[PDB]
Design a protein around this ligand. Sequence first.
Ligand SMILES: O=C(O)COc1ccccc1
Length: 167
Amino acid sequence: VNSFSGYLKLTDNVYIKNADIVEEAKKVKPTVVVNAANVYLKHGGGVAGALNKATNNAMQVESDDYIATNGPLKVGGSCVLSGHNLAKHCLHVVGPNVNKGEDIQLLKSAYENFNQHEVLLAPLLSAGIFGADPIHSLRVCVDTVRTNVYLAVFDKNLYDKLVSSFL
Ligand SMILES: O=C(O)COc1ccccc1
């Protein structure tokens, strides 16, 4: 049993809800919240800007020190950092940004990072401001992630479309 409430069950392991991932993290304090990161961990907007704002910029301060030490992530890669006031840990995952020309085949690699964690609160990777088709992102999630994932969809309209179109 876990703390997640009000999710629709899509599969054995994938669950979905219309929710503000920031508000959901604050309420649940999950072991892992996923950030929709970029390779530079520059948390300007979308999920990353909202998560970082909720940490009062502590996420960006930690991220800048991580990049200064390690250099940028790979598209499709991840790193584990603090979850600050939102979660135990933040898994920063870089999905391909279609609005930068990145290969959408990298979306499967991105979601494979989730399998290193038994339970996660996450957004749909490469969805929203990253420019991918969210219906596609949900299909790759379902077909890739084997661990238990709780998906927070920001757009209420999009949530209903994702549910109503799900195979
Ligand atoms: O709903 C999400 O989580 C990402 O996709 C969006 C679609 C429309 C507007 C904002 C986000």
